[PDB]
Design a protein around this ligand. Structure first.
Ligand SMILES: Nc1ncnc2c1ncn2[C@@H]1O[C@H](COP(=O)(O)OP(=O)(O)O)[C@@H](O)[C@H]1O
Lengths: 755, 482, 131
């Protein structure tokens, strides 16, 4: 019977929309916008409009809460969908309001609610259905008790709707559709998917897990930077799946006068057991169960013990699930991680790039953005921001836009005109001004993201390209071959070469090509942990790297520590010992099954301690040569691609004269010409302005002042200031070390011995 | 304290019974850890109630704690808690038994071989294994999918009628496994046998003379007035497989093996020094007999020599503690200590004294037949095909350690993988170019680990060890010879 | 706690108000400084009452303090105190205006050189100039 569909949580909040997958439409020959009949329990029927959505699975039907209550069904059940091609345009529809929704209004229901809701909607409606219409503050639920024709009818412009009479009573099924959904969460795709996987099944089907004897999770710790909107995620999940979300705040359990505080907690838990499938949310967990050494009195210990005893008291009983939020996974008491208590941890990281866009596209819903607004550019230029910061930025941009045009909207008051204020299309200047006066919150925080650097940016270094290809791509793409052959992949690679070049660019390019997270570690923070705390920091860095597997960890300037060891200090060697030993010990404990690569780059190889260069640690050594011809041309093209044009010069000629030049020097050479262009353009503008003040309106017509192009003469002007960044002796030392290493692998070939 | 007194009084009234106290550290931590006065009152009440068990009834009190140092030493006097039992992390057999116990109600498929499944779970406990089983079942469920079905009020039977768990489920669960042991020492009888290593008849003879004899036949030792040697120090070129020798002799002696590495030794300089050494040697003693193994013993001096000259104090601290701890050993327990190093001339002379590490054994590089045997040990793999002779492979590889041979063996598999993957990609491309040209599933290229693969792999043969080291070691040996 | 609460609902029931909490560091100090137990309760009460400003509210809360390190970090999340303004020490010109307002009631002579005084008073605040 390939006609039924299993209901699932939907995204669209409209009362008459259902989301279907394309194979279902192809199988049932259902078009877009047609009326379909849905049947559930209690012999109830409803009419819906088919809408396209590729997110939903073929077997699952996305269908909202209002029709879910109309059909007297719950999520996870099965409904019957059939085509309804016999629908006819309605003649008259009689609707009545519920008694406990019109309390204290005293107004025209038709003009405020019915007319805007039924305008250009063509909603098919049926007798006995409940539909919810939003208003100023409340949401009014209306019931169709009479229709013509019955039971199926289509709202049409020539339809008489009556809304006069005594309101009907409550339907005892709450017939509601409200509050947040999945559309209000952005930039958390992976985390939201993970939360859905392990929370939906124990709640939607409270017996299938018991059939296989799978223990559902009994506690989930969502930890991340503050302000990311974890409470919103929990509320959306609870409201979508269907539960009794009971938020208990942190400080509210501490302001009470001692004893009764504990009682409150106890009450909450029992208050959450009668209602069946409930999701308790303990916000600000660190404020009531902090680190043990922070505690100084006795009440906090009693509260912690009470919480632990109750949490162990959730053994079986109902399907209640405990979700707690904190800041970092080391501030809470270390005793709240024993099996049975909080054991699953989810990292809600800082949104990056693409995700940020959706956040803005959520906030700029009602506001009418101008055509000149480029939200993609705003998302790209803004980094280190969280949802709260972006919301505040949008709010202050709107405030600036309305402040500029104050007198045009009758600055006094007088029932502010909606169209006039809506005409305030926010401009790009407003967004830039808001960006200038906006202090972010993330700032100093490690960022995990997928880089966008591609291989064509660098020349390619086809030998090194193939070597890194073999080292990285194959283990993750095809691990079946490795497990068949039993070979254990290499875990570390060490680069060496002249300073600058393309180390970081190569690492980011291979990380992008492998489609894996990237983490950048630099020398200054290495020396930061050198001067003091040297054990923990590396530990949580490695746990963070492991948690987001697969990833390509990068250690930049690993030799820097040694640079501190060899000098006139002779005091921090203990710190270097601490750092190196911690790094080596943590690499030794890294299981080979987890795909966490480690790439370290050192400018001076032979100073580093030969302890690292041993099996089980960074094994392969790769020499990165200076860019030559083709790589130089690629770097120059990438640099010039940013904005200006150079359609007057020969690039391979410049590459010919620039032998022995590193990539950074080429970037500086490209940058100098732009400064020359800026100076010439500004001086020309000043000359034009001065000759304009000498004779008013001297150039009435705006001619072609120097437009963007880097002319040839600018290229000689910039190139005259060129530096040989690296001296030849550095190349001599690098090649001498390379040949010293290579001479080990020297043997007089082979002759197929006795085969 | 009223509840505790009531519990003890009730247990007194109801015949010989067992009282279990869970999380004893939560109620009786160290005295100086305690801050207020309620904790001290509770601890003293517990002490008094414990001391009040004179006769009374046949009541036995059993308590569980995580670490043996968190307990207030007041709860260690005779009459109070005096017998200690350590429930260590289960070994491979224990993991297999736990997996057998948990995978009872689950209807598995006829494709499960839990041997390597337990083998690949180094560092897990019972709860982690149960979570892994649940995750595997959960993948079984989500791969089945609730594709428009009517599991209402009959869900359990309707799903249990036909379900199974396959290899891919357990593989995923192994990927999504976060072990809880990790940073924790391991004690278990090793598995490496004498066949794994190659030759070295004299070293094996000496090791079995100094290890196997005093444990299997201690009566003759006592009759003849024997004090067996307590320590042996291995020295030689690096990468010769000293740890293999130690593990093999431990396996032959059927004694537990405990390993301590270099980085941990250097880490113990800065911060906790007394506690770690004390607890590790106590743990070695309690699990007698055991062969305690120290790796990279010379690294201490390797940090002393440099432009810093500040870590020498902590190095002397650790070495002093270790020396004082060996001097306290007793012949009662068969505790054996083995040290390994590659730079013996920088070892402090205080170590090489009677009672401490005295016997020195030089480990020569594998030669001729030993190279054949180590390759044969490496010759297992899964995909060895039929291969070729190896005597001249040993003949050509004079002066090559085990690490170089392992690298040479590993490089050939890399070339084979590259060949197989490039062939597969070319085949996939030609499938796109010509549809339906490979309707029949033609067999993929076999594991052709062929002569040419080895020939190209061992073209990059590295002389990892130099030549002057051998004369240095033989000069040191001649210095020993008198 | 009763006084602070009563002040909050008293400000709630009257008009758009501006509650000014003076010397905030005296009641919400650094975590390590909170040796007692009453301070934690007062801080929690303040946080809860601050968060109890649900949407419909005309109350704006302003606070005064020294360098923004003595204030406990939990008071600087989103929803609580978020906007910060630095009232720096006035410069020579600012000192000139401070002298100007402070001397409007005063009857000065014809030898007064307010510009020189403003120039020479580097390192002073309004109270010092008033004194
Ligand atoms: N789609 C979204 N993704 C992430 N954050 C959001 C989104 N929409 C709103 N937010 C932010 O969530 C905040 C509210 O969540 P909050 O109660 O602060 O949770 P928490 O206290 O866990 O940070 C708002 O300030 C808003 O800026």
């Amino acid at each position: 019977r390939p006609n039924r569909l299993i209901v699932d949580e939907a995204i669209n909040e409209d009362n008459s929309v259902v989301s279907l997958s394309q194979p279902k439409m192809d199988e049932l020959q259902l078009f877009r916008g047609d009326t379909v009949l849905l049947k559930g329990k209690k012999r109830r029927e409803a009419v819906c409009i088919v809408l396209s959505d590729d997110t939903c699975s073929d077997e699952k039907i996305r269908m909202n809460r209002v029709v879910r209550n109309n059909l007297r069904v719950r999520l996870g059940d099965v409904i019957s969908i059939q085509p309804c091609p016999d629908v006819k345009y309605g003649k008259r529809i009689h609707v009545l309001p519920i008694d406990d929704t019109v309390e204290g209004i005293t107004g025209n229901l038709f003009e405020v609610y019915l007319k805007p809701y039924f305008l250009e909607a063509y909603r098919p409606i049926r007798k006995g259905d409940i539909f919810l219409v939003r208003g100023g503050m409340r949401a009014v639920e209306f019931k169709v008790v009479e229709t013509d024709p019955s039971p199926y009818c289509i709202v049409a412009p020539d339809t008489v709707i009556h809304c006069e009479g005594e309101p009907i009573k409550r339907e005892d099924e709450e017939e509601s559709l409200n509050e947040v959904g999945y559309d209000d969460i952005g930039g958390c795709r992976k985390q939201l998917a993970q939360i859905k996987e392990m929370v939906e099944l124990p709640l939607r089907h409270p017996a299938l897990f018991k059939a296989i004897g799978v223990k559902p999770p009994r506690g989930i710790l969502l930890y991340g930077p503050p302000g990311t909107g974890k409470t919103l995620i929990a509320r959306a999940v609870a409201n979508e799946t269907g539960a009794f979300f009971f938020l208990i705040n942190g400080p509210e359990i501490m302001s009470k006068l001692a004893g009764e505080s504990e009682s409150n907690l106890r009450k909450a838990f029992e208050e959450a057991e009668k209602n069946a499938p409930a999701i308790i949310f303990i916000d600000e967990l660190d404020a009531i169960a902090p680190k043990r050494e922070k505690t100084h009195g006795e009440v906090e210990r009693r509260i912690v013990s009470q919480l632990l005893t109750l949490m162990d008291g959730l053994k079986q009983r109902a399907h209640v699930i405990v979700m707690a939020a904190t800041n970092r996974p080391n501030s809470i008491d270390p005793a709240l991680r024993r099996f049975g208590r909080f054991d699953r941890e989810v990292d809600i990281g800082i949104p990056d790039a693409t995700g940020r866009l959706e956040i803005l596209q959520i906030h700029t819903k009602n506001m009418k953005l101008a055509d000149d607004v480029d939200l993609e550019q705003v998302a790209n230029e803004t980094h280190g921001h969280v949802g709260a910061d972006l919301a505040a930025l949008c709010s202050e941009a709107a405030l600036q836009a309305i402040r500029k045009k104050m007198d045009l909207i009758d600055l006094e008051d007088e029932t502010i005109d909606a169209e006039v204020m809506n005409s305030l299309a926010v401009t790009m200047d407003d967004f830039r001004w808001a960006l200038s006066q906006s202090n972010p919150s993330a700032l100093r925080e490690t960022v995990v993201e997928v880089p966008q650097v591609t291989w064509e940016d660098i020349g390619g270094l086809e030998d090194v390209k193939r070597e890194l290809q073999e080292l990285v791509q194959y283990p993750v793409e095809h691990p079946d071959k490795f497990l068949k052959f039993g070979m254990t992949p290499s875990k570390g690679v060490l680069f060496y070469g002249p300073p600058g070049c393309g180390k970081t660019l190569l690492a980011k390019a291979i990380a992008n090509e492998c489609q894996a997270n990237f983490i950048s570690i630099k020398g200054p923070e290495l020396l930061t942990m050198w001067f003091g705390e040297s054990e923990a920091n590396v530990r949580e860095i490695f746990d963070k790297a492991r948690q987001a597997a697969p990833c390509v960890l990068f250690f930049d300037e690993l030799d820097s520590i040694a640079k501190a060891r060899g000098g006139n200090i002779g005091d921090g060697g203990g710190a270097a010992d601490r750092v190196i030993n911690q790094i080596l010990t943590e690499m030794d404990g890294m299981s080979t099954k987890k795909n966490v690569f480690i790439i370290g780059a050192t400018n001076r190889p032979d100073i580093i301690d030969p302890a690292i260069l041993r099996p089980g640690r960074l094994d392969q050594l790769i020499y990165i040569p200076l860019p030559d011809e083709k790589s130089r041309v690629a770097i120059l093209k990438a640099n010039l691609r940013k904005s200006p044009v150079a359609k007057d010069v020969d690039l391979e000629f410049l590459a010919k004269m620039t032998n022995g030049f590193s990539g950074a020097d080429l970037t500086e050479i490209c940058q100098r010409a732009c400064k020359l262009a800026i100076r010439e353009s500004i001086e020309s503008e000043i000359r034009r302005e001065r000759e304009r003040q000498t004779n008013p309106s001297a150039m009435e017509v705006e001619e072609d002042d120097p437009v963007p192009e880097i002319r040839r003469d600018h290229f000689e002007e910039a190139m005259r200031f060129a530096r040989r960044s690296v001296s030849d002796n550095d190349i001599r030392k690098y090649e001498m070390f390379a040949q010293t290493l290579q001479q080990s692998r020297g043997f007089g070939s082979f002759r197929f011995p006795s085969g």
